[PDB]
Amino acid sequence: QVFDERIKFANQLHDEYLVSMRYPEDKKTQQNEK
Amino acid sequence: VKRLLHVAVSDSNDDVRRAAVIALGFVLLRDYTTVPRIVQLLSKSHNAHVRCGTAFALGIACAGKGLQSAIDVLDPLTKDPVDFVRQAAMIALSMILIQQTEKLNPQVADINKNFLSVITNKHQEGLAKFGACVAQGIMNAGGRNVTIQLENADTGTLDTKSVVGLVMFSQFWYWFPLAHFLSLSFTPT
Amino acid sequence: KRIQSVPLVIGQFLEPIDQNTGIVSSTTGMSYVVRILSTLDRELLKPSMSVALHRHSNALVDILPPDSDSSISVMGENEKPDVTYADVGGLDMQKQEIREAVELPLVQADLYEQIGIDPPRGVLLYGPPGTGKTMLVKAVANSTKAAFIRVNGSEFVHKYLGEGPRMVRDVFRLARENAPSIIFIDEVDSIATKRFDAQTGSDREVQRILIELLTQMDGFDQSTNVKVIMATNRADTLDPALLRPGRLDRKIEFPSL
């Protein structure tokens, strides 16, 4: 029963992370670069 | 929108994927601002017909409207070595660039050079220079007067003659050029 | 699947150009531009190596090992000898000298790093073969779990000039990639013999076989990727420079009493 909770604990770090990559990145494509 | 999206993905037919992305532009005629953002996402794929359909579908709503940035979306589609992708791009450029000269859009200088550049060049595609000559006459159609107006304030509703003439354009080299039906969408200003 | 599948051919890599692009040389002699594997980039990709290619599509397949087995300059190699170690008495003097010169440099050589010296690259043997030489050395390779390769003085003997030393170049080149390898030399006096006369035709090869043997030993620095055991049968005035503790360490003479 406790073993199944550790699977969700590692999966809980996904939606708060993979989504946070492009989050700041919208300023790179909009702003002009050298 | 959700129906036409799954047709161009699950189905492996390139002609159907091309017809599905062109059909999306007729639903988006009301909002021309989000059209370049939708066709640019579909402009990246492994199929040429997908890029060919999104090219002409972009110029349908963006012809008589503003938002000059739709030309930059059609810029990488011209460099495509595929023949029918370049032709649909040239026709799409001629629709949006109407009356865009004289310090309005910077891309009016590059399109005017491509008139005689693609035809005389042997490196380009056969069908690429055939549409470049047609695109040269669209901007100057009616003595640089008539333009393509679809879903505007003058008509007040969806133009029946203009929407059918654009559907017939989707079939060009498959049977015999149908471009004669496009004359219904040209009205003078 | 289309890169390899069933059809495969042989080719020699030369120089790359771009990622997944390279120029090679096939067996027929005509060069072709193949598609370099995505795994091979710079360090993993060998500058010059014999590799595998595709028949028609001509794509890179795999890096083939530099096999030294052919119809010319044949050098025998033993696989898993059946001789039991320490099967002959009276070897207690050598049994202490064998482990330090064989088992230690191929296994415990890290102890030499604590001392600050490079591991011995071989050992010299004296006396006629058959006594603590043939059966004894072949039984030591089973204890060290190393590849036992037979390169003798009367081997790689053929009338084509230059392949004798060329085959020597290919054996020690492969021995540098595989650490557990042992190359035994029986009757080195055949190699240690020099030219006392001009032979014109017939045998000119007396002095060529020492070029690549010393290049892989006296030419490079001191490192042991392989065990080179030189057994001297009968030699008096021959000084090839194989003697002295330049590379090989111990000089073992079979007791006559």
Partner: protein, 255 residues
């Protein structure tokens, strides 16, 4: 027993014979196959058709011409010499007097046992529209043989151009358990013993399972070792974008 390997070209062309002529339920087409019947694995490299006429209202009425086979075999001799007649196929699930008698006519030109194939023209249910059966006597008894689909290298590649996990098996497993319940009920009405005696022995394969529960969780615990790997994979998923996320702040200074 033996084995039957049928190329996908034979099963694809056999179904086409039904649609072209719009054959009704009163007529059933019959055809022949080629291959090598000498080995234990029957391989079908070719198939043909025959002008077979049959009456539905009378099972004693059938017409089969063997002269058309003779002229056809002479044409194959100039094409492929390794192709011999290994049997024949017919259309429709029903086995009547006309279908069982004509099997002996093909035994004259076939040295081994002619392969029996029942072609389903309506392709209704499960897979394998054409089942491979063998004729053997103890009354002719038709036994089912393992059906495998294997073709040559060039044939398998050409099919991919024409068409160019856990839930999938469960969808077909639910309909299979329900179909087995109807086979017992339908067989009961036919009697009012042979199949029921075999099914009772197959079904024979918690008194001894009181201590057998531990080994179930032991296998599940070993599966959890892979779940710990999944956690490590999830830990590695957390390392991936941090390489990119730290490069985001590096571009803020450059831009």
């Amino acid at each position: 027993h033996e084995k039957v390997t049928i190329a996908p070209l034979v099963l694809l062309s056999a179904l086409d014979h039904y649609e072209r002529t719009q054959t009704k339920e009163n007529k059933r087409c019959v055809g022949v196959i080629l291959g090598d019947a000498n080995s234990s694995t029957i391989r079908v490299t070719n198939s043909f058709a025959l002008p077979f006429e049959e009456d539905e209202k009378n099972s004693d009425v059938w017409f089969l011409d063997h002269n058309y086979i003779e002229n056809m075999n002479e044409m194959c001799k100039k094409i492929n010499a390794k192709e011999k007649l290994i049997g024949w196929y017919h259309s429709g699930p029903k086995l009547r007097a006309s279908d069982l008698k004509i099997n002996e006519l093909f035994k004259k030109y076939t040295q081994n046992n002619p392969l029996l194939l029942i072609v389903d023209v309506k392709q209704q249910g499960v897979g394998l529209p054409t089942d491979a059966y063998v004729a053997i006597e103890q009354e002719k008894t038709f036994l089912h043989l393992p059906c495998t689909i294997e073709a040559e290298e060039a044939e398998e590649i050409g099919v991919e151009h024409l068409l160019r996990i856990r839930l999938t098996n469960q969808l077909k497993s639910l309909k299979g358990l329900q179909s087995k319940l109807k086979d017992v009920v339908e067989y009961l009405d036919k009697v009012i013993h042979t199949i029921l005696g075999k099914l009772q022995d197959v079904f024979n394969l918690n008194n001894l399972q009181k201590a057998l529960t531990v080994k179930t969780n032991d296998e599940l615990m070993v599966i959890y070792i892979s779940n710990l790997v999944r956690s490590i994979i999830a830990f590695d998923d957390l390392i991936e974008n941090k390489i990119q996320n730290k490069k985001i702040q590096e571009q803020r200074v450059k831009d």
